[PDB]
Design a protein around this ligand. Structure first.
Ligand SMILES: [Cl-]
Ligand SMILES: [Cl-]
Ligand SMILES: [Cl-]
Ligand SMILES: [Cl-]
Lengths: 105, 104, 105, 104
């Protein structure tokens, strides 16, 4: 009569201890995972920082090269134009030279 | 005496329930923190991948430009040489004309 | 789960209080009956003492009367015997008296 | 900690059982005392009845004896009176005889 009540009372005590041990373990496991993930987050931030720095370097070099190549195309076109002008000058000069050569004979 | 028994049993069971609620609350709080962290970590992993991929592309385009620059230098050199030849022909031809015109 | 255990625990407490109150009442009731019966026993002892004293008185009076009556029967028998002797004496005397009366005539 | 719970529950239930046994023992002890008393009280009640009945009988026999004593006194008185009459007749007759014998 009274022993069955104490027996069930002891069992509830057992269940409470188990629930306490389990929840404490789970809480510590979550806390340890939080501290791990915060170290990972900081490592990733530093990795991103260095990658953004490298991207800036190479992007600047690319833009400088693009502009330098645009200038070379411009200069070459201009020298080609000058070549064509000099050919015109040669043509008129050569024509006069031939006239004088023939006339003096 | 007997209401004491009733009262102490009531308060003990109430304390146990309170203790259960508080523990489950703290568990759900830490779990939400873990979820937020996992979302940040994933977003940063993506950003890292895209930065690595972008660095690669820009490097490749830089190599292409360096090669184009070489070819353009060769082209400008050849056009300069032709230009100088034409300049010499012009000057020599102009002085010849001036001489012929003086004589006549 | 835990409330049913505490409820049954409270009930066992109720049963224990009732058992305590009942057994205490019964014990006091028995003690009060003991004290009553001891007063009765002493009263009866004194009643018996006086009855034995009265019996002795009346028994003595009875025995004295019995003996006194036995003596009266004895005395009466003896006086009857003496009467018969005196009658014998009268008979012999009267016989002689008659002789003398007749002879002197 | 947990064996503490087991131990305290065990000792408490043991104390309760002890307390129950002691109470029932004291009850049976007082009950046996009440039985002994009821047997003494009954025996004394019987003795009282028999003493009252005996007193009555002896008183009645005493009354009978007193009456017998009266009748015996009357009888002795009558026998004495007759005895005295006979004594007178004897004495008177004896002196007469003595006189007659002197004369003759
Ligand atoms: Cl050309
Ligand atoms: Cl042109
Ligand atoms: Cl007679
Ligand atoms: Cl006789």
């Amino acid at each position: 009569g009274l022993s069955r009540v104490y027996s069930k009372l002891y069992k509830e005590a057992e269940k409470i201890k188990k629930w306490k041990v389990s929840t404490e373990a789970e809480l510590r496991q979550k806390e340890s995972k939080l501290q791990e993930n915060r170290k990972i987050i900081e490592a990733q931030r530093k990795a991103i920082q260095e990658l953004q720095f490298g991207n800036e370097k190479v992007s600047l070099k690319l833009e400088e090269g693009i502009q330098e190549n645009k200038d070379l195309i411009k200069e070459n076109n201009a020298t080609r134009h000058l070549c064509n002008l000099l050919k015109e000058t040669c043509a008129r000069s050569a024509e006069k030279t031939k006239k004088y050569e023939y006339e003096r004979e």
